Amino acid sequence: MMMKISFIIATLNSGGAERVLVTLANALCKEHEVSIIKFHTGESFYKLENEVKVTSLEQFRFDTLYHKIASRFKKFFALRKALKESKADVFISFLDTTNIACILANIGLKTPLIISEHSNEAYLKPKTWRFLRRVSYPFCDALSVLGSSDKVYYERFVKRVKLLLNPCHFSDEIPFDSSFEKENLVLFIGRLDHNKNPVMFLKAIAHLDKNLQENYKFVIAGDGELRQELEYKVKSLGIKVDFLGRVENVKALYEKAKVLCLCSFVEGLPTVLIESLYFEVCRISSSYYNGAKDLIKDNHDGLLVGCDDEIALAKKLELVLNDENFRKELVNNAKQRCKDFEISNIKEEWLKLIVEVKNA
Numbered sequence: 044m045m046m047k048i049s050f051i052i053a054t055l056n057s058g059g060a061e062r063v064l065v066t067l068a069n070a071l072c073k074e075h076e077v078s079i080i081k082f083h084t085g086e087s088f089y090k091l092e093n094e095v096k097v098t099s100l101e102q103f104r105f106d107t108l109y110h111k112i113a114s115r116f117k118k119f120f121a122l123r124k125a126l127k128e129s130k131a132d133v134f135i136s137f138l139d140t141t142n143i144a145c146i147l148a149n150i151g152l153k154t155p156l157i158i159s160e161h162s163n164e165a166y167l168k169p170k171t172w173r174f175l176r177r178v179s180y181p182f183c184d185a186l187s188v189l190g191s192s193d194k195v196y197y198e199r200f201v202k203r204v205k206l207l208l209n210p211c212h213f214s215d216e217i218p219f220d221s222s223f224e225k226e227n228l229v230l231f232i233g234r235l236d237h238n239k240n241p242v243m244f245l246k247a248i249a250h251l252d253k254n255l256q257e258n259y260k261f262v263i264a265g266d267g268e269l270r271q272e273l274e275y276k277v278k279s280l281g282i283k284v285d286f287l288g289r290v291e292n293v294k295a296l297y298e299k300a301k302v303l304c305l306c307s308f309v310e311g312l313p314t315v316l317i318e319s320l321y322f323e324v325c326r327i328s329s330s331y332y333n334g335a336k337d338l339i340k341d342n343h344d345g346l347l348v349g350c351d352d353e354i355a356l357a358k359k360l361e362l363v364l365n366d367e368n369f370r371k372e373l374v375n376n377a378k379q380r381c382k383d384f385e386i387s388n389i390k391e392e393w394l395k396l397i398v399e400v401k402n403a
């Protein structure tokens with residue numbers, strides 16, 4: 044048949060949620076009809092299919108104490124307005140702040156709201172939002188949730204929670220079993236904020252053999268608030284890491300690169316650890332909060348280090364990089380996880396969930 048799907052997100056900037064949304068949208072787009080409603084005006088970082096109808100809420104002023112409070116009622120009713128005027132068969136919204144907003148704004152309309160947590164339940168640190176999520180989330184119609192520990196957490200107070208994986212858009216593009224002629228390149232891809240923890244990457248490149256360190260290229264794709272101080276500490280330790288910062292063509296690095304390191308303290312299902320599956324990139328990652336083992340059979344299809352162990356990382360790095368027959372084995376076992384992220388399969392459960400929610 045057919046449905047109007049409306050996606051509601053804050054921004055469409057170089058993120059992980061926005062990466063999933065567009066993969067789905069681009070895929071549902073062809074059979075169905077897919078509006079996106081995004082708050083912060085601007086363009087999308089990710090090539091968005093042409094049929095995807097995209098509508099941005101207004102720009103609002105947050106100067107003056109008046110406009111500081113007023114622009115929330117104006118935003119809210121501007122949101123309720125767009126939702127009404129989408130006449131969508133279903134609303135799917137993304138991330139806690141946007142999710143709680145949508146639940147309130149949707150109070151009234153007779154259309155289903157899906158909402159999805161896209162990060163471990165413990166990330167939401169403050170006390171008010173952790174509370175508003177507890178009161179408002181049982182009023183949605185379903186709930187997408189990535190890690191199992193989050194389903195066990197959200198099932199306590201939400202009646203319909205589903206575990207949907209993320210869909211890797213590379214799954215259709217990159218043929219399974221492709222020759223990759225790699226280059227001495229280690230990749231760090233991600234936001235340069237405190238949790239993503241890029242400093243541990245630097246500290247660890249410091250501790251590598253001069254042999255390796257002088258023949259390998261190290262690269263930090265991504266930008267954050269740490270992009271300045273990271274460059275300072277790169278001098279303080281004195282290594283050669285090439286900050287590129289928000290590079291829309293990560294496919295180009297993902298090929299040449301041999302290894303990819305993730306250093307974050309807590310995550311849900313990082314797509315950087317999913318995309319590598321498609322490029323014979325070997326993953327090395329901190330045993331981050333909770334969902335670590337769901338993604339990496341340590342020493343079988345990846346390598347896990349203690350959280351924030353600058354040395355542990357370097358050893359594992361030096362381990363793979365002094366050993367091509369190993370790196371090459373790990374990834375051939377990692378190719379095995381590729382299916383668990385094909386958009387084709389992931390899309391149809393989104394479609395399945397939309398159907399049951401559209402009944403009642």
Ligand SMILES: CC(=O)N[C@@H]1[C@@H](O)[C@@H](O)[C@@H](CO)O[C@@H]1CP(=O)(O)OP(=O)(O)OC[C@@H]1O[C@@H](n2ccc(=O)[nH]c2=O)[C@H](O)[C@@H]1O
Pocket residue numbers: 057058059060062063161162163166189209232233234238264265288289290291292293307309310311312313314315318
């Ligand atoms: C701390 C945290 O809770 N992170 C969550 C994560 O656990 C997942 O749940 C994920 C999916 O919902 O969302 C967040 C990931 P987060 O926002 O941190 O991003 P991620 O690591 O999962 O992936 C983001 C990345 O952006 C891209 N990129 C990077 C650099 C660049 O120059 N250009 C790019 O396009 C990548 O291709 C990529 O997929």
